[PDB]
Subunit: 157 residues, 2 copies
């Protein structure tokens, strides 16, 4: 259990596992986002391959949070740039100062702390969204999307 | 309090308010999404105008959930189409069968129920994302975005 030997794990199961193993808790909604970001065969659950992908990232994020935190479980908003730098999955991704500011507002609590579940969500989403662009763009400058393409990319994540 | 008379409400305050007034609870992360979707002056809090915008929607969603639910607090996944139909803010938005399927996977729990906080998130996000497209598209068929435009739209929400 929480090993995914040819079996699957859904968001509800994933939540119980992450909260028991890693921990500020992961919400069920966040786990549904994690499933959405990591699915290859889209069916609302993670097979062994998809789970391995998620797990490798989670292990990595644990290390990054441990390295960057000011104290056990406390990562400061002003150190979020260091979390990005320490996340190899983001290689080649450069965000603007303004975008960093927006993500800081979105992922940090009211006293300038970023929880582990919040950091996980942010780093996985940043990677997914940056890779979508880089992979779909024909010139690396812009992206053209159909309505249906746009809506699917922005709604299932 | 929870009235926002020239004052502001942040996501943490918003969470306490929504959970006390409406309720399955809103997570803090969901409240940060709600703030992001409703901001006009982007600073991580809702001023009186932004809060009014959020509140009008929330009142509407309450009515829709009450109308469509199978029993107190139980909205079935298979009835999500009826929630969309009953939400005037979505007027002019048509989603595909496939997109409906994806959102069902993303917003429903493991037994085919959609919680009130999940419905709120879904209906607000659908509206925001559809309006972005409709408003940015020059022909109503496609959208061209710069990298920076793409990343900002997909990360702050
Ligand atoms: Ca799958
Ligand atoms: Ca504001």
């Amino acid at each position: 259990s929480g090993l995914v030997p040819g079996s699957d794990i859904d968001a509800t199961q994933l939540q119980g596992l992450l909260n028991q193993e890693l921990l500020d808790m992961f919400s069920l909604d966040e786990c549904r986002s994690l499933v959405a970001l990591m699915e290859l065969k889209v069916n609302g659950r993670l097979d062994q391959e998809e789970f391995a992908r998620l797990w490798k990232r989670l292990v990595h994020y644990q290390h990054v949070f441990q390295k960057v935190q000011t104290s056990p479980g406390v990562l400061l908003s002003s150190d979020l740039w260091k979390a990005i730098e320490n996340t190899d999955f983001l290689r080649g991704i450069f965000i603007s100062r303004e975008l960093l500011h927006l993500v800081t507002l979105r992922y940090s609590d009211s006293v300038g702390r970023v929880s582990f579940p919040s950091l996980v969500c942010f780093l996985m989403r940043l990677e997914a969204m940056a890779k979508t662009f880089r992979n779909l763009s024909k010139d690396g400058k812009g992206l053209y999307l159909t309505e249906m393409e746009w809506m699917s990319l922005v709604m299932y994540n």
